[PDB]
mmCIF file of C-alpha atoms in Angstrom:
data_model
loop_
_atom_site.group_PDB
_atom_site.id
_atom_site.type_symbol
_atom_site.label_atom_id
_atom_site.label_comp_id
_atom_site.label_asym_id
_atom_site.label_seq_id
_atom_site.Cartn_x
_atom_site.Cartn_y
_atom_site.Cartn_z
ATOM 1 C CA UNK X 1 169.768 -60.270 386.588
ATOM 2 C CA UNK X 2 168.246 -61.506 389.829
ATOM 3 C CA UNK X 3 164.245 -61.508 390.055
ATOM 4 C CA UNK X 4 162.396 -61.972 393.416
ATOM 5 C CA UNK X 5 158.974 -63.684 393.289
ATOM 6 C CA UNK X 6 156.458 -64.506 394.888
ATOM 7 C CA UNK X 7 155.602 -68.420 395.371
ATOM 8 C CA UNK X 8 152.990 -69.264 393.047
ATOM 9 C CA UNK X 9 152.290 -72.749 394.459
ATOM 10 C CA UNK X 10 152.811 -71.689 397.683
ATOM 11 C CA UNK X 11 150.460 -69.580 399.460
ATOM 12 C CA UNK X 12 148.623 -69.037 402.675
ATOM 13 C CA UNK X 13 150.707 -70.119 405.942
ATOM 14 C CA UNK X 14 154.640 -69.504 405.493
ATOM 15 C CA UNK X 15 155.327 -72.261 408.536
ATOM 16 C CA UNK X 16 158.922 -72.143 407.951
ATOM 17 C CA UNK X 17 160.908 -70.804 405.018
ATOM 18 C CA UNK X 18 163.055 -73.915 404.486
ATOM 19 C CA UNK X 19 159.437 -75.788 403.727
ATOM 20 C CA UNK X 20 159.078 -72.843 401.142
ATOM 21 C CA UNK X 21 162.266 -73.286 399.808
ATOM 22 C CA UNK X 22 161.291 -77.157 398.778
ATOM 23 C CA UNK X 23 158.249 -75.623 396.508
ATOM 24 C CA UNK X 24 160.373 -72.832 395.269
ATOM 25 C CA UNK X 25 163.561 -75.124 394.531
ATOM 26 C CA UNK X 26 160.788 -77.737 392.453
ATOM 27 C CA UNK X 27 159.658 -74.655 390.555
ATOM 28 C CA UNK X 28 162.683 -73.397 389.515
ATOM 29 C CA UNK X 29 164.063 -70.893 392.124
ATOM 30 C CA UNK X 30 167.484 -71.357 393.855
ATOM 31 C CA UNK X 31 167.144 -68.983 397.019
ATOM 32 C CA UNK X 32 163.992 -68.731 399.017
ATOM 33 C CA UNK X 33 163.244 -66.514 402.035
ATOM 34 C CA UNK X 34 159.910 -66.363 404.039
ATOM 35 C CA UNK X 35 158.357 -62.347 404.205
ATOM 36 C CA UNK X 36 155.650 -60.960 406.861
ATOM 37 C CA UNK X 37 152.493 -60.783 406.481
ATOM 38 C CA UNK X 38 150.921 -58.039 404.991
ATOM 39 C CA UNK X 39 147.418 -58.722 403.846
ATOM 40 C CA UNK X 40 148.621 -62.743 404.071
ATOM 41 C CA UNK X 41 151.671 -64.254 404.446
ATOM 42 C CA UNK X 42 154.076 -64.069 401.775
ATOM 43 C CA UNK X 43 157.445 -66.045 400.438
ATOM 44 C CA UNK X 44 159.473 -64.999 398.489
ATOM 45 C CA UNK X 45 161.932 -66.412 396.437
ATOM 46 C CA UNK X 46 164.837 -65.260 393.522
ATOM 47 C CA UNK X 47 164.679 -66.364 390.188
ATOM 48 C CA UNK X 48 167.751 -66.016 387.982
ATOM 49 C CA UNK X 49 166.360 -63.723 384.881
ATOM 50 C CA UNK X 50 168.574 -62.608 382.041
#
């Protein structure tokens, strides 16, 4: 399966989505796309889940 989630160590301004794809790719998540901001800005990026 393929899981979206939301960057855990990455939170507040969403400058660019490749800079969010650097955190995401250290956690553990291969693709990473910025969102808009709802309440705050959000990133999110897919996890591979079984």
């Amino acid at each position: 399966r393929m899981c979206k989630t939301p960057s855990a160590k990455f939170k507040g301004y969403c400058v660019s989505s490749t800079n969010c794809k650097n955190v995401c790719r250290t956690e553990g998540f291969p693709t990473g796309s910025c969102d808009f901001h709802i309440t705050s800005r959000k990133c999110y990026c897919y996890k591979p889940c079984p």
